[PDB]
Amino acid sequence: MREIVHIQAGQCGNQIGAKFWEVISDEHGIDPTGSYHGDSDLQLERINVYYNVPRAILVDLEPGTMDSVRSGPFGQIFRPDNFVFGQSGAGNNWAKGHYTEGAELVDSVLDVVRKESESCDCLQGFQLTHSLGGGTGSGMGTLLISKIREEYPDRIMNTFSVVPSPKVSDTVVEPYNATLSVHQLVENTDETYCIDNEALYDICFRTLKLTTPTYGDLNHLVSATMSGVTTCLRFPGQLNADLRKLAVNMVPFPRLHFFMPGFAPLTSRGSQQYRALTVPELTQQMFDAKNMMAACDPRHGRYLTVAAVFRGRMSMKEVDEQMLNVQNKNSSYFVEWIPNNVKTAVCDIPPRGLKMSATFIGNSTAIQELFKRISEQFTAMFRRKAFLHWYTGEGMDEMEFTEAESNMNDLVSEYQQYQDATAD
Amino acid sequence: RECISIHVGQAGVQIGNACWELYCLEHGIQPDGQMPSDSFNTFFSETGAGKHVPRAVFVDLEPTVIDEVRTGTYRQLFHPEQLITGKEDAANNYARGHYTIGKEIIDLVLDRIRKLADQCTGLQGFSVFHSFGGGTGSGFTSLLMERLSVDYGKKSKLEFSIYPAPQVSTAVVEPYNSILTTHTTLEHSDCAFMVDNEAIYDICRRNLDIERPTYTNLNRLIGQIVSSITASLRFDGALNVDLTEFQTNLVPYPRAHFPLATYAPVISAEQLSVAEITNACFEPANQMVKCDPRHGKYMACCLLYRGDVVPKDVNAAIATIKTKRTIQFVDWCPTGFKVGINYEPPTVVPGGDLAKVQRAVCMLSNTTAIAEAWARLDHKFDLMYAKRAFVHWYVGEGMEEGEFSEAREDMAALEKDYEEVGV
Amino acid sequence: DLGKKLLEAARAGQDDEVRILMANGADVNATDASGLTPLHLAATYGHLEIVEVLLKHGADVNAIDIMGSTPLHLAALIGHLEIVEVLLKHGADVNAVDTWGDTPLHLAAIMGHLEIVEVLLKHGADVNAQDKFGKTAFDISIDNGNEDLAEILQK
Amino acid sequence: LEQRASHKVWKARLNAYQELNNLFTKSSVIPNDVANYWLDPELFASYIVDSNVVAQENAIIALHTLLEYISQVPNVSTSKLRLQWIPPLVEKGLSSSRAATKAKATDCIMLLTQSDTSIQQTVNLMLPSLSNKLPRLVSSCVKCLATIIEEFGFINVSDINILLSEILEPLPKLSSHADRNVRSETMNLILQIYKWFGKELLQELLLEKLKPIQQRDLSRMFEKYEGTIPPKQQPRLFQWQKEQEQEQEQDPFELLPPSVILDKFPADFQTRISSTKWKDRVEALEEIHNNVLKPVKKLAHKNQDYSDYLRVLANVIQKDANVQAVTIAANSVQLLCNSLRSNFTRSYGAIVLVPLLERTKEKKPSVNEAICSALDAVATYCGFDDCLEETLNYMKHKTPQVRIECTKFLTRMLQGWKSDGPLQNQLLFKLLPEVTTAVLKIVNDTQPTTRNTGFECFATLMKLVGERELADPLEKLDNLKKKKIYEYYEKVEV
Numbered sequence A: 001m002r003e004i005v006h007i008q009a010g011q012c013g014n015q016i017g018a019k020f021w022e023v024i025s026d027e028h029g030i031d032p033t034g035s036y037h038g039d040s041d042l043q044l045e046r047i048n049v050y051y052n053v054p055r056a057i058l059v060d061l062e063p064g065t066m067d068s069v070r071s072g073p074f075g076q077i078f079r080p081d082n083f084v085f086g087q088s089g090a091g092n093n094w095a096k097g098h099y100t101e102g103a104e105l106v107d108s109v110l111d112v113v114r115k116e117s118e119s120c121d122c123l124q125g126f127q128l129t130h131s132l133g134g135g136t137g138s139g140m141g142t143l144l145i146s147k148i149r150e151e152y153p154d155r156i157m158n159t160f161s162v163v164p165s166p167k168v169s170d171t172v173v174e175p176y177n178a179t180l181s182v183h184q185l186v187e188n189t190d191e192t193y194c195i196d197n198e199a200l201y202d203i204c205f206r207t208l209k210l211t212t213p214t215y216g217d218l219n220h221l222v223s224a225t226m227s228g229v230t231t232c233l234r235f236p237g238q239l240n241a242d243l244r245k246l247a248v249n250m251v252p253f254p255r256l257h258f259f260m261p262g263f264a265p266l267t268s269r270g271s272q273q274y275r276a277l278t279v280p281e282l283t284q285q286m287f288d289a290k291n292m293m294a295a296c297d298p299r300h301g302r303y304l305t306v307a308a309v310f311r312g313r314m315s316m317k318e319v320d321e322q323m324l325n326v327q328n329k330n331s332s333y334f335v336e337w338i339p340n341n342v343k344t345a346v347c348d349i350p351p352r353g354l355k356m357s358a359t360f361i362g363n364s365t366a367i368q369e370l371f372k373r374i375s376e377q378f379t380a381m382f383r384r385k386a387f388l389h390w391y392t393g394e395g396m397d398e399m400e401f402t403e404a405e406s407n408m409n410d411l412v413s414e415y416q417q418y419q420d421a422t423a424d
Numbered sequence B: 001r002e003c004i005s006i007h008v009g010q011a012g013v014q015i016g017n018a019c020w021e022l023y024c025l026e027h028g029i030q031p032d033g034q035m036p037s038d039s040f041n042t043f044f045s046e047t048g049a050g051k052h053v054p055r056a057v058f059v060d061l062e063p064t065v066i067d068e069v070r071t072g073t074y075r076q077l078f079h080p081e082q083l084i085t086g087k088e089d090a091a092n093n094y095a096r097g098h099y100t101i102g103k104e105i106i107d108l109v110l111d112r113i114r115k116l117a118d119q120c121t122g123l124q125g126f127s128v129f130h131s132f133g134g135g136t137g138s139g140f141t142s143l144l145m146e147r148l149s150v151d152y153g154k155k156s157k158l159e160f161s162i163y164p165a166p167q168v169s170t171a172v173v174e175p176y177n178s179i180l181t182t183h184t185t186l187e188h189s190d191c192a193f194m195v196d197n198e199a200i201y202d203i204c205r206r207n208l209d210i211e212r213p214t215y216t217n218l219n220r221l222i223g224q225i226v227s228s229i230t231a232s233l234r235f236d237g238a239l240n241v242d243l244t245e246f247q248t249n250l251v252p253y254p255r256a257h258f259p260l261a262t263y264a265p266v267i268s269a270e271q272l273s274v275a276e277i278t279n280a281c282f283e284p285a286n287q288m289v290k291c292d293p294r295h296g297k298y299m300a301c302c303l304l305y306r307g308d309v310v311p312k313d314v315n316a317a318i319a320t321i322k323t324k325r326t327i328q329f330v331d332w333c334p335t336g337f338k339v340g341i342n343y344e345p346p347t348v349v350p351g352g353d354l355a356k357v358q359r360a361v362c363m364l365s366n367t368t369a370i371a372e373a374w375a376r377l378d379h380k381f382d383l384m385y386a387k388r389a390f391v392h393w394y395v396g397e398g399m400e401e402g403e404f405s406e407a408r409e410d411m412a413a414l415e416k417d418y419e420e421v422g423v
Numbered sequence C: 001d002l003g004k005k006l007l008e009a010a011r012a013g014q015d016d017e018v019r020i021l022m023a024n025g026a027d028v029n030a031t032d033a034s035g036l037t038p039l040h041l042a043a044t045y046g047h048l049e050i051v052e053v054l055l056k057h058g059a060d061v062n063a064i065d066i067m068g069s070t071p072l073h074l075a076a077l078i079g080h081l082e083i084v085e086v087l088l089k090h091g092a093d094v095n096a097v098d099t100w101g102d103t104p105l106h107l108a109a110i111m112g113h114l115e116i117v118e119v120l121l122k123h124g125a126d127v128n129a130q131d132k133f134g135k136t137a138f139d140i141s142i143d144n145g146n147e148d149l150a151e152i153l154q155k
Numbered sequence D: 001l002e003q004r005a006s007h008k009v010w011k012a013r014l015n016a017y018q019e020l021n022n023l024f025t026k027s028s029v030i031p032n033d034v035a036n037y038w039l040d041p042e043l044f045a046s047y048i049v050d051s052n053v054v055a056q057e058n059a060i061i062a063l064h065t066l067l068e069y070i071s072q073v074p075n076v077s078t079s080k081l082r083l084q085w086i087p088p089l090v091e092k093g094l095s096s097s098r099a100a101t102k103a104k105a106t107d108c109i110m111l112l113t114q115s116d117t118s119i120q121q122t123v124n125l126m127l128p129s130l131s132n133k134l135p136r137l138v139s140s141c142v143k144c145l146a147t148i149i150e151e152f153g154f155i156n157v158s159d160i161n162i163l164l165s166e167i168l169e170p171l172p173k174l175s176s177h178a179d180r181n182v183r184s185e186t187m188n189l190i191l192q193i194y195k196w197f198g199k200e201l202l203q204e205l206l207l208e209k210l211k212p213i214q215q216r217d218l219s220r221m222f223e224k225y226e227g228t229i230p231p232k233q234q235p236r237l238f239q240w241q242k243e244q245e246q247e248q249e250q251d252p253f254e255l256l257p258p259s260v261i262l263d264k265f266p267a268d269f270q271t272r273i274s275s276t277k278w279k280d281r282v283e284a285l286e287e288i289h290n291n292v293l294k295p296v297k298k299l300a301h302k303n304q305d306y307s308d309y310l311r312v313l314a315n316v317i318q319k320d321a322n323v324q325a326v327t328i329a330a331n332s333v334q335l336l337c338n339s340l341r342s343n344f345t346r347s348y349g350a351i352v353l354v355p356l357l358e359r360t361k362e363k364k365p366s367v368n369e370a371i372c373s374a375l376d377a378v379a380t381y382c383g384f385d386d387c388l389e390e391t392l393n394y395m396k397h398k399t400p401q402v403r404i405e406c407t408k409f410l411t412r413m414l415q416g417w418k419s420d421g422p423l424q425n426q427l428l429f430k431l432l433p434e435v436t437t438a439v440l441k442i443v444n445d446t447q448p449t450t451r452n453t454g455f456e457c458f459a460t461l462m463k464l465v466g467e468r469e470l471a472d473p474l475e476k477l478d479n480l481k482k483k484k485i486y487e488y489y490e491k492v493e494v
């Protein structure tokens, strides 16, 4: 369990994807030319995970995205062969990405995926970043996932999917696209981090006091969260070391693998608070719903499993105490029938900018609130049958929408079942 | 007369290092294998060039730990064919250790065991070191134990299990893995010494005076207590001189073969009497498994003293405890405490937090109070299996769901077996 | 199972291999299928040294089986006078009853063990004890034509 | 222990008889060359006369189950057996004083009697034993003769006239025999002959010659008999009769004129189907399917080569990236196989078979629907020609989905397995070697949904070829997997 192959698809996919590579290239001490200028062994200890030069494949039907990446800061480092791009775009049509146009290109992509996997000592799994309200990131991404799932069934599939919200784009077909994509992810992926644009806006607007957040502002929150959750994977550490062990200790039921991520402290684009947080303060950004990357209230549900990642030099004794504290002082919020369901890990290397930080990966049943929002928007649209001729024209059947609608509602019911469950 | 040791998973492998480090100091053997100085050849073989090689196999479904074994201080001690590694680990999944991944390497492992058994003339049996909660430790060991009961069926096999503890626990599913291996390894094990990592944690925090112990801290403490049990096999004592005697003295029921080990004294490096250390053997604080023997009946009890000990001091300390405490025995037991002594002093590691003591004792006692330890696992197991939590991982790697229930019933039946003896 | 080899030995009468199996901590009161301890079996087939070996190691002198038979029942049935007095000296139940209502006095009288009958009587046997059908030991001598036994029962 | 059946020690022969009895119940029904207690029947003729009454009885009950393990075809060698076996059976089995030694010897003769075409050859051999010293032998062998009749009867007997004389001849001496039992059990044999053709015949031939008191009791016995003069139905049938009854208990609209579609094709077809634009390919296929194939109901058998059209349907079903173009193609392939039955002999069948099996990988319900339904078409018209071998090949394939679907395919085919002939079909030539070794790879898969398909695909196998024949790999399987396999065996039909 060593190497990880990375993929980014669609506009958003390559945006937050490149942002992620910017962050962890710095943290590992790699320059845009691809040369080590660090000063620690903990940097090159597990560099073989994400690098060889990144083990990253860039995909989009939109050919313009090609240049938006290479003209970016770390755009020079990606392998030219691993760029695989179509002629036209999907235009917010999930069917075009999944059945027609996105399907024609997916073979070219699998050829490069094979190439990178071929020269791996021991593959762990895969890693995809994409948006769910689009046509390419959602339609072709979910199609790529299934196509890999069947070509590499002995490997992990881990996705960073961002949820659409009316606050960030008023496109009304996004409820369709996201619902169809969730119908795929519940069956095809081992673990999925739920990045909610609804919550990214509400954090930049209300907590960071930015009247008009841009994509870059929301992408800053994302790239920092990704480096936080992937800290265990990229540096030496006992707990939650590889992808499979993580999913083993996070996912008790195969379909319920949608994590609500959140981390602290919340900073703006290059602002410094001048005051480093304390360990009990960081700990008290867990239930603090203003730090959740998904627009859900953990108070309104129950945690099935929790993974905490504290970065920086601090007291391992105090972290254990504070985590053991906050668990039992809110004992009604953690499921009783899974003992020792919260697991904490520490990494001495902090993220750049911050002296201390803490990321809070949680499988909370409150996540059903998120899927409620998508379904109600989907159903309002679907009951009046708006824009259906887009999808049906591309070979889709009207029945598919009903199945995805019903399958998401079963997913909501399941979360509600285990929320109301008792140990007695 | 020989005995082969096997180490499975990180737990087995890393405790193995601590034990063979401690064996080589007790036998004056060098890291390169030489010796400027038999009973000890029960454990070691000999090269034509005056080199002493352990009779040991190291197994892990993942290089990282054994790679450090293969390049550690004791890299020259082992033959490279003894250190076996896979590539994909079991990922805390009994199914992968036993079914999916374990079958890919089980034959290579059994083959390398035959090479050490072919060097031996009168092989006694096997010592096995492994964790409970680990995927490799649970799954692969239970498989290897099944296959050793075939290819070597007519001889003994002893376990050294690491009972899990939330303070160092790496996985949620550790109750599952413990129950699953204990079910399938029950019939194939003649005797099995459990090690509760919580007690070793508690001991290291209280008596070694450490805030947050590391694995080295726990392993060194554990390696001392393992040495105390295997001392009889390595120096030709009077008690427990071969592997059969362990079953004779401690196992009056094939299933109930889980002795409680108590070790005194654990002295920080920053002397006691014979009577004082023997009283500490009946203090729960110094047990390796957290339970209360006062709530149970003793089926057997052995005392393995080593060091500056006068045989009469022992008999006085015995009569004191047999008169001034109420150690309840079962009526169908000899009720007499067996004793053995080895006048060599307890060796510690140069630099270790554990201090050199003048004398030491390790009490092995098959008390029915150890059922409390099984009850704690069974309860945790029940909570998760009531909702079928994490079960899809196991079933998805070649395992039938029924095996969960068949294992749970075998654990409930064992809990009744402990009850009926003690009433 | 070591408790099963000790039954095999105590029955077939290998005096030496009892000490071997018992030195390995075999269950002195190990039950077979019908609840018979080794003391039962040795007292049936007349192995006096094996009886005294098991008794002094702690053998239930008044252990019953699935049919309520004590070793004193079986010794008085087959007619092992040497073993009967060993059991009684080790606190055997002289007026034990079994599932058919018989005492050891019933069995020794039926089988014509006049020498054992007198030993049981002097250890306080119940001469008026009845079985299921309602017959005493004295009724058995009347029914069976034994006048040597009728006189030995009224002594 | 094969030669131990004739060992000097009795308790060593006693084993081999139990060993044999366990073999004839646990052996393969088609049968191992090890089951050579037919070609040398002197063997069991020796065993039945064992010099130990306890090991004798065990030899007879081994002969008994042997003599019912022979209930399978072809064992026309039952003539040689009755000659070799029933004289030892009568002489010393019926003779025996042992309760069970006798009962199984009679039951043995029963099974040898129904091996035959009629009762005459068995009767003719056991008649001489009526003239033996020992009464209890003639006492018994007149009872056995009497109950080979009351349950079987005289049918398919060449010369009944010669047979009736041969069995009526001793009846005067038997009925005046000293033994009470020989007499009492002779009146029963008389009744059982009357019960089949009396009273008129035997009153002139036999009843005249008996004691008057005797012929009174026989008349009293005929009044108590109710039922027609010959019994309407026999209480037991022979082997050739029961099989004929079982076989007794157990126009095609295709005559329509054939239509030709080659003329229907358009010019802009070959480039359209081999185009890079997906909608070109879709419309191309969708047109010739909805306009050209869906209307027709019978294609032209004579002189029409579709193996140019069918090999381009294969090219898309295998390699075409458009899942929609696949779905509409497999539905076309089915239509060809459906409206043109008896055409897909080899070239046609094999041109699309291995492509279809590759594409079961598709998980979209509509697409798996069409691919599988097409594979059902080629199967129903290529029976087991190339599919049986290649379906196995793709059960061994790496994709999880193709394993579960190609195994479900074998399950579908196996339910519609009704090949002609008694035995030795393509299924049996490769059953244990290939089919079972491959189905176990599914039964022992890592995934549950995969394993669960194997559990049906093994319970549909046992249903076809006997849950006893495959009891060998059943034992090697987990007791836990066993009760899942049996679960489906109880609910599965053919």
Ligand SMILES: Nc1nc2c(ncn2[C@@H]2O[C@H](COP(=O)(O)OP(=O)(O)OP(=O)(O)O)[C@@H](O)[C@H]2O)c(=O)[nH]1
Pocket: B008, B009, B010, B011, B012, B014, B015, B061, B062, B089, B090, B091, B092, B093, B130, B131, B132, B133, B134, B135, B136, B137, B138, B162, B164, B165, B168, B169, B170, B171, B174, B197, B215, B218, B219, B222
């Ligand atoms: N006392 C002690 N416990 C250990 C040691 N190593 C691991 N453990 C415990 O064993 C349990 C399972 O961990 P491992 O044994 O490392 O798992 P593994 O056998 O290597 O199996 P995989 O890593 O999944 O392939 C954990 O709860 C640890 O606390 C050790 O060196 N000493």
Ligand SMILES: Nc1nc2c(ncn2[C@@H]2O[C@H](COP(=O)(O)OP(=O)(O)O)[C@@H](O)[C@H]2O)c(=O)[nH]1
Pocket: A009, A010, A011, A012, A013, A015, A016, A062, A090, A091, A092, A130, A131, A132, A133, A134, A135, A136, A137, A138, A162, A163, A164, A165, A168, A169, A174, A197, A200, A215, A216, A218, A219, A222
């Ligand atoms: N957080 C974030 N969300 C984005 C970004 N770009 C697009 N989105 C969201 O993703 C959805 C649009 O999908 P998009 O990725 O642009 O379409 P695609 O190119 O076909 O994958 C909308 O809900 C947007 O709000 C970005 O840079 N950051």
Ligand SMILES: [Mg+2]
Pocket: A010, A011, A012, A062, A134
């Ligand atoms: Mg776009």
Ligand SMILES: [Mg+2]
Pocket: B009, B010, B062, B089
């Ligand atoms: Mg490990």
